[PDB]
Amino acid sequence: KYQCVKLNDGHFMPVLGFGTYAPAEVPKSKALEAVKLAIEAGFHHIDSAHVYNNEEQVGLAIRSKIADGSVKREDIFYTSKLWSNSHRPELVRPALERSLKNLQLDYVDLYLIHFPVSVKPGEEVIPKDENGKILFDTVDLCATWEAMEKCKDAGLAKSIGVSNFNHRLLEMILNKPGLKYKPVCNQVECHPYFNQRKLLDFCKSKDIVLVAYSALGSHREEPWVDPNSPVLLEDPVLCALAKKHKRTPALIALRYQLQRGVVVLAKSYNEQRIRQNVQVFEFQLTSEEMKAIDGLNRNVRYLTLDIFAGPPNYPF
Ligand SMILES: NC(=O)c1ccc[n+]([C@@H]2O[C@H](COP(=O)([O-])OP(=O)(O)OC[C@H]3O[C@@H](n4cnc5c(N)ncnc54)[C@H](OP(=O)(O)O)[C@@H]3O)[C@@H](O)[C@H]2O)c1
Ligand SMILES: CC(C)Cc1ccc([C@H](C)C(=O)O)cc1
Numbered sequence: 001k002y003q004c005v006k007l008n009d010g011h012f013m014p015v016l017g018f019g020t021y022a023p024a025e026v027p028k029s030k031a032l033e034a035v036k037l038a039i040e041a042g043f044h045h046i047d048s049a050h051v052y053n054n055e056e057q058v059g060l061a062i063r064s065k066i067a068d069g070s071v072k073r074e075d076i077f078y079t080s081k082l083w084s085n086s087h088r089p090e091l092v093r094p095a096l097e098r099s100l101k102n103l104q105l106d107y108v109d110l111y112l113i114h115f116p117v118s119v120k121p122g123e124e125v126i127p128k129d130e131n132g133k134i135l136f137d138t139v140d141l142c143a144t145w146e147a148m149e150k151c152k153d154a155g156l157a158k159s160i161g162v163s164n165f166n167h168r169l170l171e172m173i174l175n176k177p178g179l180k181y182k183p184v185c186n187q188v189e190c191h192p193y194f195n196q197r198k199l200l201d202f203c204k205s206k207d208i209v210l211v212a213y214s215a216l217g218s219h220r221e222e223p224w225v226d227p228n229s230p231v232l233l234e235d236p237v238l239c240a241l242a243k244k245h246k247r248t249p250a251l252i253a254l255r256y257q258l259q260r261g262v263v264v265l266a267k268s269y270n271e272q273r274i275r276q277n278v279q280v281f282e283f284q285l286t287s288e289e290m291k292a293i294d295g296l297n298r299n300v301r302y303l304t305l306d307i308f309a310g311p312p313n314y315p316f
Helices: 029-041 055-067 089-103 141-153 167-174 197-205 236-245 249-259 271-282 287-294
Strands: 004-006 012-014 016-019 045-047 077-082 108-113 157-163 185-189 209-213 263-267
Touching: 012 077, 016 029, 016 271, 029 045, 029 055, 029 271, 055 089, 077 089, 089 108, 089 141, 108 141, 108 185, 141 157, 141 167, 157 167, 167 197, 185 197, 197 209, 236 249, 236 287, 249 263, 249 271, 249 287
Parallel strands: 016 045, 016 263, 045 077, 077 108, 108 157, 157 185, 185 209, 209 263
Antiparallel strands: 004 012
16 A cells, blocks of 8 residues: 545545656666666656656566566556647647557556647657747647547546646636546646745645655756756755754655645655655654745746747746
């Protein structure tokens, strides 16, 4: 057994997920090993994406752990995401089916719209013209969502959701005429420097689960993240809570999210840290500790994806 939350479609999501993105200077081999170690440690939820360029490796890890008897397929919650070169409705199912072929899995547990700004179709994930300009595309995300619904009805995705959506974009889906399935989740950046209280409450009001990424202050990969941003885990309040509990600041940051009703991702490719992170289930924070962490909020967004700024659907 392991801790899960019931989604608005009746499926269950494990509340601690393993993040699989690593910057390109990290060999893809490392993904295979790290996912195996995460499953061994007790992660039951694994987060990936077509754009991470690691589905072959992540899928092999999962297949391996199934085939050697370590875990059953029903005890792994696997998430993929629809990249922005496949927003057009007729391209949605093919992108899911391409991810599934790479993974050699029959279905994903969850399929998300990765990012709300669309780019032109083709193999290239960031298509550019001759002059370096991103080739943006104009697509009705409501149409994309109907295609996602169809994938759910096909059994290719058990659940569907969104990522990096703001209030306005969530509302566009929620108010869509003929809506079949609400998003089960909105996967967004969330940590004690950017605690997303407003958007969290909105999502709660609609029984949409907020899934936190960069919960430990991000990969900090350039140019995606400003190197001059503060380092979350050096925070002196987090460090003193850690000392107090004989834990680590990472574990404090993880535990904060679980208690506020957020599902939390954590990426690590380091064996010790992977094992550490599952200790989030071993302790609890008091109401005064939770309020101390709430106090850290400082409107610091690590991940702007500002190469996609300009189009109306840019969410920040
Ligand atoms: N939907 C999206 O647009 C989106 C965006 C960003 C992230 N995500 C997802 O969310 C996941 C996590 O976000 P993130 O990759 O930005 O990273 P994160 O989980 O915030 O942090 C990863 C960093 O913290 C380190 N770390 C992990 N556990 C630690 C611990 N116990 N003590 C200290 N350091 C620790 C890791 O280094 P080591 O590997 O060396 O341990 C890594 O450098 C991604 O991998 C991806 O799955 C999604
Ligand atoms: C690095 C780039 C070529 C691909 C890419 C695009 C978007 C994302 C988002 C922000 C995420 O981290 O999930 C990651 C990687």
